[PDB]
Amino acid sequence: LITRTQAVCRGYLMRVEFIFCIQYNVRAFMNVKHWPWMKLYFKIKPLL
């Protein structure tokens, strides 16, 4: 009974501990910098 009560409590904490919108939107933002022209203006102009 004591070990089982502690087991239900561990149960509760892990169910409470049990991000998607951040990870995909952050990745979609990462892919902003793939467009060739974006890369180009960034090298074309340190060389003015």
Side-chain angles (χ1 to χ4, degrees):
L1 273 34
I2 303 297
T3 61
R4 300 296 179 201
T5 302
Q6 300 164 313
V8 188
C9 285
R10 277 166 176 128
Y12 183 109
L13 295 168
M14 180 50 50
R15 255 164 290 184
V16 177
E17 294 174 10
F18 193 78
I19 196 170
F20 183 77
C21 295
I22 299 169
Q23 287 175 319
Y24 193 70
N25 291 308
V26 172
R27 278 168 169 139
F29 177 72
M30 184 179 71
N31 296 345
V32 171
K33 299 182 180 179
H34 280 105
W35 293 103
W37 302 101
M38 189 177 298
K39 298 174 181 174
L40 292 181
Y41 78 74
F42 198 75
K43 341 170 194 167
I44 290 165
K45 259 191 295 297
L47 308 174
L48 300 189

Short mmCIF file of all heavy atoms in Angstrom, two decimals:
data_model
loop_
_atom_site.label_atom_id
_atom_site.label_comp_id
_atom_site.label_asym_id
_atom_site.label_seq_id
_atom_site.Cartn_x
_atom_site.Cartn_y
_atom_site.Cartn_z
N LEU A 1 0.78 -1.22 0.00
CA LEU A 1 0.00 0.00 0.00
C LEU A 1 0.83 1.29 0.00
O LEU A 1 0.58 2.18 -0.81
CB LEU A 1 -0.96 -0.07 1.21
CG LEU A 1 -2.31 -0.78 0.95
CD1 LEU A 1 -2.26 -1.96 -0.04
CD2 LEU A 1 -2.97 -1.24 2.26
N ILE A 2 1.89 1.38 0.82
CA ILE A 2 2.81 2.51 0.80
C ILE A 2 3.54 2.67 -0.52
O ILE A 2 3.60 3.76 -1.09
CB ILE A 2 3.80 2.44 1.96
CG1 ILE A 2 3.07 2.36 3.33
CG2 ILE A 2 4.87 3.56 1.95
CD1 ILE A 2 2.22 3.58 3.71
N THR A 3 4.06 1.57 -1.09
CA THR A 3 4.76 1.56 -2.36
C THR A 3 3.85 1.89 -3.53
O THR A 3 4.21 2.66 -4.42
CB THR A 3 5.49 0.24 -2.65
OG1 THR A 3 4.61 -0.88 -2.70
CG2 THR A 3 6.46 -0.06 -1.51
N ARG A 4 2.61 1.36 -3.52
CA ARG A 4 1.56 1.70 -4.46
C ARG A 4 1.16 3.17 -4.39
O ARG A 4 1.01 3.79 -5.44
CB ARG A 4 0.28 0.82 -4.31
CG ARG A 4 0.41 -0.71 -4.49
CD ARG A 4 0.82 -1.25 -5.85
NE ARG A 4 0.87 -2.74 -5.64
CZ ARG A 4 1.55 -3.58 -6.41
NH1 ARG A 4 2.27 -3.15 -7.44
NH2 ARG A 4 1.47 -4.89 -6.19
N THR A 5 1.02 3.80 -3.20
CA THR A 5 0.70 5.23 -3.09
C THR A 5 1.77 6.09 -3.73
O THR A 5 1.50 7.02 -4.49
CB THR A 5 0.54 5.77 -1.67
OG1 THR A 5 -0.47 5.07 -0.97
CG2 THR A 5 0.12 7.24 -1.64
N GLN A 6 3.05 5.74 -3.48
CA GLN A 6 4.21 6.36 -4.09
C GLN A 6 4.25 6.16 -5.60
O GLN A 6 4.62 7.05 -6.36
CB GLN A 6 5.49 5.83 -3.42
CG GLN A 6 5.52 6.13 -1.90
CD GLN A 6 6.57 5.29 -1.18
OE1 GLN A 6 6.68 4.08 -1.38
NE2 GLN A 6 7.36 5.93 -0.29
N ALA A 7 3.83 4.97 -6.08
CA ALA A 7 3.64 4.69 -7.49
C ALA A 7 2.56 5.53 -8.17
O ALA A 7 2.80 6.07 -9.25
CB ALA A 7 3.36 3.19 -7.67
N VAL A 8 1.37 5.74 -7.55
CA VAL A 8 0.35 6.65 -8.06
C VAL A 8 0.84 8.10 -8.12
O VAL A 8 0.66 8.79 -9.12
CB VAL A 8 -0.99 6.62 -7.30
CG1 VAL A 8 -2.05 7.47 -8.04
CG2 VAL A 8 -1.55 5.19 -7.13
N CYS A 9 1.55 8.58 -7.09
CA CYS A 9 2.19 9.88 -7.07
C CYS A 9 3.23 10.08 -8.16
O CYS A 9 3.24 11.10 -8.86
CB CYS A 9 2.91 10.01 -5.72
SG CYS A 9 1.71 10.35 -4.38
N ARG A 10 4.12 9.09 -8.39
CA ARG A 10 5.04 9.09 -9.53
C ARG A 10 4.28 9.11 -10.84
O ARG A 10 4.60 9.87 -11.76
CB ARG A 10 5.99 7.86 -9.48
CG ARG A 10 7.21 8.08 -8.56
CD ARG A 10 7.98 6.80 -8.22
NE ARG A 10 9.16 7.25 -7.41
CZ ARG A 10 9.51 6.76 -6.21
NH1 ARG A 10 8.95 5.68 -5.69
NH2 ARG A 10 10.45 7.40 -5.52
N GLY A 11 3.21 8.30 -10.93
CA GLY A 11 2.21 8.33 -11.99
C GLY A 11 1.66 9.68 -12.35
O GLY A 11 1.68 10.06 -13.52
N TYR A 12 1.18 10.43 -11.34
CA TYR A 12 0.66 11.78 -11.44
C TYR A 12 1.71 12.74 -11.97
O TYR A 12 1.47 13.45 -12.94
CB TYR A 12 0.12 12.25 -10.05
CG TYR A 12 -0.52 13.63 -10.00
CD1 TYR A 12 -1.91 13.75 -9.82
CD2 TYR A 12 0.24 14.82 -10.03
CE1 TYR A 12 -2.52 15.01 -9.73
CE2 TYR A 12 -0.37 16.08 -9.92
CZ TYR A 12 -1.76 16.17 -9.78
OH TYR A 12 -2.43 17.41 -9.70
N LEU A 13 2.93 12.75 -11.39
CA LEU A 13 3.98 13.66 -11.81
C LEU A 13 4.40 13.47 -13.26
O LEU A 13 4.42 14.42 -14.04
CB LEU A 13 5.22 13.56 -10.89
CG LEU A 13 4.96 14.02 -9.44
CD1 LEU A 13 6.14 13.62 -8.54
CD2 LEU A 13 4.75 15.54 -9.36
N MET A 14 4.63 12.22 -13.70
CA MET A 14 4.93 11.93 -15.10
C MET A 14 3.79 12.24 -16.06
O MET A 14 4.01 12.75 -17.16
CB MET A 14 5.42 10.47 -15.24
CG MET A 14 5.78 10.01 -16.67
SD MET A 14 6.90 11.05 -17.65
CE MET A 14 8.28 11.29 -16.48
N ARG A 15 2.52 12.00 -15.68
CA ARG A 15 1.38 12.45 -16.47
C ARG A 15 1.30 13.97 -16.61
O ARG A 15 0.93 14.49 -17.66
CB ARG A 15 0.04 11.85 -15.95
CG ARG A 15 -0.52 10.72 -16.85
CD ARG A 15 -1.59 9.84 -16.18
NE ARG A 15 -0.84 9.07 -15.15
CZ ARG A 15 -1.33 8.11 -14.36
NH1 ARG A 15 -2.62 7.92 -14.14
NH2 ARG A 15 -0.44 7.31 -13.77
N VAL A 16 1.68 14.72 -15.56
CA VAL A 16 1.82 16.16 -15.59
C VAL A 16 3.02 16.65 -16.41
O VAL A 16 2.98 17.70 -17.05
CB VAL A 16 1.81 16.68 -14.16
CG1 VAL A 16 2.02 18.20 -14.06
CG2 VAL A 16 0.42 16.36 -13.58
N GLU A 17 4.16 15.93 -16.42
CA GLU A 17 5.31 16.25 -17.24
C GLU A 17 5.14 15.89 -18.71
O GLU A 17 5.72 16.53 -19.60
CB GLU A 17 6.58 15.55 -16.68
CG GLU A 17 7.01 16.07 -15.28
CD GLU A 17 8.16 15.29 -14.64
OE1 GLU A 17 8.79 14.45 -15.34
OE2 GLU A 17 8.43 15.55 -13.44
N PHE A 18 4.30 14.88 -19.00
CA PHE A 18 3.93 14.41 -20.32
C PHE A 18 3.39 15.54 -21.19
O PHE A 18 2.74 16.48 -20.74
CB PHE A 18 2.88 13.27 -20.20
CG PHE A 18 2.67 12.52 -21.48
CD1 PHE A 18 3.60 11.56 -21.90
CD2 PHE A 18 1.54 12.77 -22.27
CE1 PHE A 18 3.42 10.89 -23.11
CE2 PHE A 18 1.37 12.11 -23.50
CZ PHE A 18 2.32 11.18 -23.92
N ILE A 19 5.26 23.15 -27.85
CA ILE A 19 6.62 22.85 -28.30
C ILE A 19 6.68 22.54 -29.78
O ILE A 19 7.63 22.94 -30.47
CB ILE A 19 7.34 21.82 -27.41
CG1 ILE A 19 8.87 21.83 -27.64
CG2 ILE A 19 6.75 20.41 -27.56
CD1 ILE A 19 9.63 20.99 -26.60
N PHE A 20 5.63 21.89 -30.31
CA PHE A 20 5.47 21.57 -31.72
C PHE A 20 5.40 22.83 -32.57
O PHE A 20 6.14 22.99 -33.54
CB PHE A 20 4.17 20.74 -31.87
CG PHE A 20 3.94 20.28 -33.28
CD1 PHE A 20 4.67 19.21 -33.79
CD2 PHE A 20 3.02 20.95 -34.11
CE1 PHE A 20 4.53 18.82 -35.13
CE2 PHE A 20 2.88 20.57 -35.45
CZ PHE A 20 3.64 19.51 -35.96
N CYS A 21 4.54 23.80 -32.17
CA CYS A 21 4.41 25.08 -32.85
C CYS A 21 5.70 25.86 -32.85
O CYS A 21 6.09 26.44 -33.86
CB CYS A 21 3.30 25.97 -32.22
SG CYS A 21 1.65 25.24 -32.42
N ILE A 22 6.45 25.87 -31.74
CA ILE A 22 7.77 26.50 -31.72
C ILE A 22 8.73 25.81 -32.68
O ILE A 22 9.32 26.46 -33.54
CB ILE A 22 8.39 26.53 -30.33
CG1 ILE A 22 7.52 27.33 -29.34
CG2 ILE A 22 9.82 27.14 -30.38
CD1 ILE A 22 7.97 27.15 -27.89
N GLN A 23 8.89 24.47 -32.61
CA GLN A 23 9.86 23.77 -33.43
C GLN A 23 9.63 23.89 -34.93
O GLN A 23 10.56 24.19 -35.68
CB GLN A 23 9.94 22.28 -33.03
CG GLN A 23 10.67 22.08 -31.67
CD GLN A 23 10.65 20.62 -31.21
OE1 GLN A 23 9.63 19.94 -31.34
NE2 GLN A 23 11.78 20.16 -30.64
N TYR A 24 8.40 23.69 -35.42
CA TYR A 24 8.11 23.88 -36.83
C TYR A 24 8.22 25.34 -37.30
O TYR A 24 8.85 25.59 -38.33
CB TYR A 24 6.73 23.28 -37.22
CG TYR A 24 6.60 23.22 -38.72
CD1 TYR A 24 7.38 22.31 -39.47
CD2 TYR A 24 5.76 24.11 -39.41
CE1 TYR A 24 7.32 22.31 -40.87
CE2 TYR A 24 5.70 24.11 -40.81
CZ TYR A 24 6.49 23.21 -41.54
OH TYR A 24 6.43 23.21 -42.95
N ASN A 25 7.68 26.33 -36.56
CA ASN A 25 7.79 27.73 -36.96
C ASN A 25 9.25 28.22 -36.97
O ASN A 25 9.67 28.94 -37.88
CB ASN A 25 6.87 28.65 -36.10
CG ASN A 25 5.41 28.38 -36.45
OD1 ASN A 25 5.01 28.41 -37.61
ND2 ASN A 25 4.56 28.09 -35.45
N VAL A 26 10.08 27.79 -36.00
CA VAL A 26 11.52 28.04 -35.97
C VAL A 26 12.26 27.42 -37.16
O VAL A 26 13.10 28.06 -37.79
CB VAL A 26 12.09 27.60 -34.63
CG1 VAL A 26 13.62 27.66 -34.62
CG2 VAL A 26 11.57 28.55 -33.53
N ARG A 27 11.92 26.18 -37.54
CA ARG A 27 12.42 25.55 -38.76
C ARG A 27 12.00 26.24 -40.04
O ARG A 27 12.80 26.43 -40.96
CB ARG A 27 11.93 24.09 -38.84
CG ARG A 27 12.78 23.13 -38.01
CD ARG A 27 12.12 21.76 -37.87
NE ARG A 27 13.15 20.88 -37.29
CZ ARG A 27 12.99 19.96 -36.34
NH1 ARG A 27 11.80 19.70 -35.81
NH2 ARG A 27 14.06 19.31 -35.90
N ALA A 28 10.74 26.67 -40.14
CA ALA A 28 10.22 27.41 -41.26
C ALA A 28 10.92 28.75 -41.43
O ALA A 28 11.20 29.16 -42.55
CB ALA A 28 8.70 27.58 -41.11
N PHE A 29 11.23 29.42 -40.31
CA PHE A 29 12.08 30.59 -40.24
C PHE A 29 13.51 30.29 -40.70
O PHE A 29 14.11 31.08 -41.42
CB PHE A 29 12.04 31.18 -38.80
CG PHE A 29 12.98 32.36 -38.68
CD1 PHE A 29 12.66 33.57 -39.31
CD2 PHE A 29 14.24 32.20 -38.09
CE1 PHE A 29 13.62 34.58 -39.41
CE2 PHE A 29 15.21 33.21 -38.20
CZ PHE A 29 14.90 34.39 -38.89
N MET A 30 14.12 29.15 -40.33
CA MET A 30 15.44 28.75 -40.79
C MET A 30 15.52 28.68 -42.31
O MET A 30 16.46 29.18 -42.92
CB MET A 30 15.85 27.38 -40.18
CG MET A 30 17.27 26.89 -40.50
SD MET A 30 17.69 25.30 -39.71
CE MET A 30 16.61 24.26 -40.74
N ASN A 31 14.46 28.13 -42.94
CA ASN A 31 14.37 28.01 -44.39
C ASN A 31 14.16 29.33 -45.13
O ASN A 31 14.22 29.38 -46.35
CB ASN A 31 13.28 26.98 -44.78
CG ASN A 31 13.67 25.58 -44.29
OD1 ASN A 31 14.80 25.27 -43.92
ND2 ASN A 31 12.67 24.67 -44.30
N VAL A 32 13.95 30.45 -44.40
CA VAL A 32 13.90 31.80 -44.94
C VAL A 32 15.20 32.18 -45.64
O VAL A 32 15.21 32.86 -46.66
CB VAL A 32 13.56 32.81 -43.86
CG1 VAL A 32 13.71 34.27 -44.34
CG2 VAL A 32 12.11 32.60 -43.39
N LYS A 33 16.34 31.69 -45.12
CA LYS A 33 17.65 32.05 -45.58
C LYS A 33 18.17 31.16 -46.71
O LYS A 33 19.32 31.29 -47.13
CB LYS A 33 18.65 31.96 -44.39
CG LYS A 33 18.33 32.89 -43.21
CD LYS A 33 19.39 32.78 -42.10
CE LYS A 33 19.14 33.70 -40.89
NZ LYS A 33 20.20 33.49 -39.87
N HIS A 34 17.35 30.24 -47.26
CA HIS A 34 17.77 29.42 -48.38
C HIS A 34 17.72 30.09 -49.75
O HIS A 34 18.52 29.72 -50.62
CB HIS A 34 16.99 28.09 -48.44
CG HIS A 34 17.56 27.10 -47.47
ND1 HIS A 34 16.89 26.83 -46.31
CD2 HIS A 34 18.72 26.40 -47.52
CE1 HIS A 34 17.65 25.96 -45.66
NE2 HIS A 34 18.77 25.67 -46.35
N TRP A 35 16.83 31.09 -49.98
CA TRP A 35 16.61 31.71 -51.28
C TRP A 35 17.90 32.32 -51.86
O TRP A 35 18.51 33.15 -51.18
CB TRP A 35 15.50 32.81 -51.22
CG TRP A 35 14.10 32.27 -50.93
CD1 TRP A 35 13.38 32.29 -49.77
CD2 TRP A 35 13.27 31.65 -51.92
NE1 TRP A 35 12.14 31.72 -49.97
CE2 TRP A 35 12.06 31.28 -51.27
CE3 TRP A 35 13.45 31.40 -53.28
CZ2 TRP A 35 11.05 30.64 -51.96
CZ3 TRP A 35 12.41 30.79 -53.98
CH2 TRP A 35 11.23 30.39 -53.33
N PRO A 36 18.40 31.94 -53.06
CA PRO A 36 19.71 32.35 -53.56
C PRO A 36 19.98 33.83 -53.53
O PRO A 36 21.05 34.23 -53.06
CB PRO A 36 19.80 31.75 -54.97
CG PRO A 36 18.95 30.48 -54.87
CD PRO A 36 17.89 30.79 -53.81
N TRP A 37 19.02 34.66 -53.96
CA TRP A 37 19.07 36.11 -53.97
C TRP A 37 19.29 36.75 -52.60
O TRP A 37 19.99 37.76 -52.47
CB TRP A 37 17.77 36.68 -54.57
CG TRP A 37 17.48 36.20 -55.98
CD1 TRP A 37 16.60 35.23 -56.39
CD2 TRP A 37 18.03 36.78 -57.18
NE1 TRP A 37 16.58 35.16 -57.75
CE2 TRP A 37 17.43 36.10 -58.28
CE3 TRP A 37 18.94 37.80 -57.39
CZ2 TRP A 37 17.73 36.45 -59.58
CZ3 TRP A 37 19.24 38.15 -58.72
CH2 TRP A 37 18.64 37.49 -59.80
N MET A 38 18.72 36.16 -51.53
CA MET A 38 18.96 36.60 -50.17
C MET A 38 20.40 36.45 -49.76
O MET A 38 21.00 37.37 -49.21
CB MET A 38 18.07 35.84 -49.16
CG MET A 38 18.13 36.43 -47.74
SD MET A 38 17.05 35.63 -46.52
CE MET A 38 15.43 35.96 -47.27
N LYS A 39 21.00 35.29 -50.11
CA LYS A 39 22.42 35.06 -49.94
C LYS A 39 23.23 36.03 -50.76
O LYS A 39 24.21 36.56 -50.27
CB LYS A 39 22.85 33.61 -50.30
CG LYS A 39 22.19 32.54 -49.43
CD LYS A 39 22.48 31.10 -49.86
CE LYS A 39 21.75 30.10 -48.95
NZ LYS A 39 21.90 28.71 -49.45
N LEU A 40 22.85 36.28 -52.03
CA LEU A 40 23.58 37.18 -52.90
C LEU A 40 23.66 38.61 -52.45
O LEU A 40 24.76 39.17 -52.44
CB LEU A 40 23.04 37.19 -54.35
CG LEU A 40 23.26 35.90 -55.15
CD1 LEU A 40 22.72 36.04 -56.58
CD2 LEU A 40 24.74 35.50 -55.17
N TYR A 41 22.57 39.27 -52.03
CA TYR A 41 22.66 40.68 -51.66
C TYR A 41 23.57 40.91 -50.46
O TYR A 41 24.20 41.96 -50.33
CB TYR A 41 21.26 41.37 -51.53
CG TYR A 41 20.53 41.06 -50.25
CD1 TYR A 41 20.96 41.67 -49.06
CD2 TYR A 41 19.41 40.23 -50.22
CE1 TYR A 41 20.32 41.38 -47.84
CE2 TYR A 41 18.78 39.94 -49.00
CZ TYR A 41 19.25 40.49 -47.81
OH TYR A 41 18.67 40.12 -46.58
N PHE A 42 23.67 39.87 -49.59
CA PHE A 42 24.50 39.77 -48.42
C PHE A 42 25.98 39.61 -48.74
O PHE A 42 26.83 39.81 -47.87
CB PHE A 42 23.97 38.55 -47.62
CG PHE A 42 24.43 38.56 -46.20
CD1 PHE A 42 23.83 39.44 -45.29
CD2 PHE A 42 25.44 37.69 -45.76
CE1 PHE A 42 24.25 39.48 -43.96
CE2 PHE A 42 25.87 37.73 -44.42
CZ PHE A 42 25.28 38.63 -43.53
N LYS A 43 26.36 39.27 -49.99
CA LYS A 43 27.77 39.23 -50.36
C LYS A 43 28.08 40.32 -51.35
O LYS A 43 29.17 40.88 -51.34
CB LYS A 43 28.18 37.89 -50.99
CG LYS A 43 27.25 36.72 -50.72
CD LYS A 43 27.62 35.52 -51.60
CE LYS A 43 26.53 34.46 -51.64
NZ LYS A 43 26.82 33.51 -52.73
N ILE A 44 27.10 40.70 -52.19
CA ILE A 44 27.20 41.79 -53.14
C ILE A 44 27.51 43.12 -52.46
O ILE A 44 28.21 43.95 -53.00
CB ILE A 44 25.93 41.87 -54.00
CG1 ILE A 44 25.84 40.67 -54.97
CG2 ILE A 44 25.85 43.20 -54.78
CD1 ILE A 44 24.45 40.50 -55.59
N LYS A 45 26.99 43.35 -51.23
CA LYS A 45 27.17 44.62 -50.57
C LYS A 45 28.23 44.75 -49.49
O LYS A 45 28.56 45.89 -49.18
CB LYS A 45 25.83 45.09 -50.01
CG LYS A 45 25.20 46.16 -50.91
CD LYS A 45 24.01 46.81 -50.21
CE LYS A 45 22.86 45.83 -49.95
NZ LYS A 45 22.31 45.33 -51.22
N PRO A 46 28.88 43.72 -48.93
CA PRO A 46 30.10 43.96 -48.18
C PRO A 46 31.21 44.32 -49.12
O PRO A 46 32.26 44.76 -48.66
CB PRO A 46 30.38 42.64 -47.44
CG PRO A 46 28.97 42.11 -47.19
CD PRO A 46 28.24 42.48 -48.48
N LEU A 47 30.98 44.13 -50.43
CA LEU A 47 31.90 44.46 -51.48
C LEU A 47 31.42 45.66 -52.29
O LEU A 47 31.37 45.61 -53.52
CB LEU A 47 32.10 43.26 -52.44
CG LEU A 47 32.47 41.92 -51.77
CD1 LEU A 47 32.50 40.81 -52.84
CD2 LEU A 47 33.82 41.98 -51.03
N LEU A 48 31.06 46.77 -51.61
CA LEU A 48 30.88 48.06 -52.26
C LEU A 48 32.17 48.92 -52.12
O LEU A 48 33.06 48.53 -51.31
CB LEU A 48 29.68 48.88 -51.70
CG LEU A 48 28.27 48.25 -51.77
CD1 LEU A 48 27.21 49.30 -51.38
CD2 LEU A 48 27.93 47.75 -53.19
#
